[PDB]
Amino acid sequence: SFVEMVDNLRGKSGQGYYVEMTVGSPPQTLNILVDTGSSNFAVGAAPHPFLHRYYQRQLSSTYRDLRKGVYVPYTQGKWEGELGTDLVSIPHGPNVTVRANIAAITESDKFFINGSNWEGILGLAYAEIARPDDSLEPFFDSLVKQTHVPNLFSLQLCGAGVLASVGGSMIIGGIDHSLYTGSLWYTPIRREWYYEVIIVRVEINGQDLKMDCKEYNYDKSIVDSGTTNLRLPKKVFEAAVKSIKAASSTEKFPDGFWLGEQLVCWQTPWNIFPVISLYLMGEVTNQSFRITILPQQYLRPVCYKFAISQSSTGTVMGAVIMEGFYVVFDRARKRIGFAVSACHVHDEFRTAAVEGPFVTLDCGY
Numbered sequence: 035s036f037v038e039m040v041d042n043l044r045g046k047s048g049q050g051y052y053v054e055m056t057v058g059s060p061p062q063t064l065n066i067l068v069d070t071g072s073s074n075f076a077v078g079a080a081p082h083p084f085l086h087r088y089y090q091r092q093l094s095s096t097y098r099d100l101r102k103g104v105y106v107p108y109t110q111g112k113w114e115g116e117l118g119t120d121l122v123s124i125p126h127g128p129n130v131t132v133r134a135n136i137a138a139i140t141e142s143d144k145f146f147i148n149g150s151n152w153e154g155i156l157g158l159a160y161a162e163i164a165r166p167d168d169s170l171e172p173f174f175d176s177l178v179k180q181t182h183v184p185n186l187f188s189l190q191l192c193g194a195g196v197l198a199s200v201g202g203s204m205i206i207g208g209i210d211h212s213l214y215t216g217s218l219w220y221t222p223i224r225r226e227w228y229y230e231v232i233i234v235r236v237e238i239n240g241q242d243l244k245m246d247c248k249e250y251n252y253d254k255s256i257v258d259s260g261t262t263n264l265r266l267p268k269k270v271f272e273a274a275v276k277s278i279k280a281a282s283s284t285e286k287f288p289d290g291f292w293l294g295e296q297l298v299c300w301q302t303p304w305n306i307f308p309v310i311s312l313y314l315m316g317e318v319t320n321q322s323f324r325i326t327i328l329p330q331q332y333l334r335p336v337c338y339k340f341a342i343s344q345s346s347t348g349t350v351m352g353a354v355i356m357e358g359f360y361v362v363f364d365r366a367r368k369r370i371g372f373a374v375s376a377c378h379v380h381d382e383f384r385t386a387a388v389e390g391p392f393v394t395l396d397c398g399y
């Protein structure tokens with residue numbers, strides 16, 4: 035039942051959302067980061083200072099070694115592991131068990147987060163970006179292939195409303211209508227590697243940034259639950275900040291705040307910060323729809339930090355964006371739906387919105 039999947043996500047603010055999963059036989063309980071921005075099922079499988087729990091293959095009667103290694107560097111650090119398969123369940127997702135690939139992380143540099151309370155990552159994106167390569171079938175592909183679970187999942191990330199605790203839901207195999215109000219709007223998945231989408235227009239408080247839309251998707255825009263911030267290409271970030279500074283000129287903040295480095299505290303003038311509208315390409319060529327997020331989303335609690343940051347790898351619509359909405363990763367129809375979340379945080383003057391269509395008279399990069 036979808037009812038039993040509601041609120042199956044937890045996390046700490048800025049440290050991601052995780053779902054409880056079991057691996058192996060007997061079931062080994064682990065908390066797993068729900069990550070639409072990667073495609074590996076990778077779980078700590080060796081002691082680590084930040085890990086209080088980890089996957090123990092030798093305890094699993096159903097573990098099978100793939101006698102294949104996997105190495106994953108990424109500037110900041112890395113993770114390295116040994117590939118195998120084992121039985122996997124999501125106790126509060128579908129009532130099914132799946133033999134999925136597992137990267138048992140045996141060593142990692144700056145991968146695990148201190149106090150996040152998750153022990154692995156569930157990469158929900160496509161095989162194309164899986165490590166070591168696209169032959170390593172991602173978890174969700176195995177799930178759909180092995181079970182009758184419909185090729186669709188939906189994320190309701192609720193945020194907050196010690197680091198603040200966040201809740202949410204991952205509904206696998208369907209759409210839970212009680213999770214959103216109003217209309218579900220779909221934007222095409224441009225390509226099945228990341229959950230790549232097209233942003234055709236953005237405005238800060240109704241004011242168009244007036245950029246060639248290729249700038250919004252340079253070199254790509256993705257929907258990524260494994261990123262906390264709204265990340266924007268340099269040129270768009272600067273214009274966004276400039277425009278947000280202007281609209282909130284009353285009250286001045288250190289540029290260290292706009293840089294997302296330091297917090298700023300009251301004991302909050304929301305109305306001073308503008309709403310941000312992302313226009314996503316519609317299923318119909320020249321149509322688009324906007325998702326409008328409040329400062330309650332792009333100012334996350336710490337006291338808040340500016341949760342909009344610069345990117346050199348294109349737009350990242352992270353949790354900051356997703357927390358306003360019910361997001362449907364309709365993989366069967368290669369599209370992503372956005373609807374106002376039943377849980378999104380808003381005051382008595384503004385509210386996160388999903389509105390369309392908007393029509394125009396080439397945005398992919």
Ligand SMILES: N#CCCCOc1ccc(-c2ccc(-c3ccccc3Cl)n2Cc2cccc(N)n2)cc1
Nearest residue numbers: 048049050069071072074145155258259260261262
């Ligand atoms: N939310 C939030 C905030 C908490 C951040 O939590 C984390 C903790 C760790 C990682 C991570 C380290 C290395 C990889 C990786 C790199 C390449 C291939 C496969 C993988 Cl697994 N990842 C996955 C990854 C990276 C970058 C973006 C996305 N979306 N996912 C990500 C987020």
